Amino acid sequence: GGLRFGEMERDCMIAHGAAGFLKERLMEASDAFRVHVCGICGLMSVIANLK
DNA sequence: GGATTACACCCAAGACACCAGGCACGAGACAGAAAAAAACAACGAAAACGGCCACCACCCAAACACACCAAACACAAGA
Ligand SMILES: [Zn+2]
């Protein structure tokens, strides 16, 4: 498994002002995903066929 | 009446529904409700007996008068 980067760790990163490190811990070191939203209704009901 | 009560990490151990009355269909019986007839109200037609005008005579009502009684100004008495 992986180690939990909990809420108090986020508080310490925020105190340090390290925004890029926080974004990288929570996205690229974890469940990063790409979704499509509708520019009109703003719901994730867009049907994307990428191929 | 609800709702919240440290943070991170390690390990082990058990279960991962079974079994029982309701829906459908599955058939009777008085009750939810429908059909009928006979004693219920009235009206048409005949019978004779109760109701209305006479006739009628005896009992209650009015007039006359009697004596009797209740009563009312006032001459007299009285404080
Ligand atoms: Zn849309």
- Assign the structural class, choosing from mainly alpha, mainly beta, alpha/beta, alpha+beta, or little secondary structure: mainly alpha
Please provide the ordered H/E string of secondary-structure elements.
HH
The termini sit apart by 34 Å
Helix content: 25-40%
Give the cofactors and ligands. Answer: zinc ion
Number of strands: 0
Number of helices, where a helix is a run of at least 4 consecutive DSSP H or I residues? 2
Radius of gyration: 16 Å
Q: Tell me about the largest β-sheet.
A: none
Q: Which oligomerization state do the chains in this entry correspond to? A: part of a larger assembly
Family: Belongs to the RNA polymerase beta chain family.
Subcellular location: Nucleus
Subunit structure: Component of the RNA polymerase II (Pol II) complex consisting of 12 subunits.
Protein name: DNA-directed RNA polymerase subunit beta
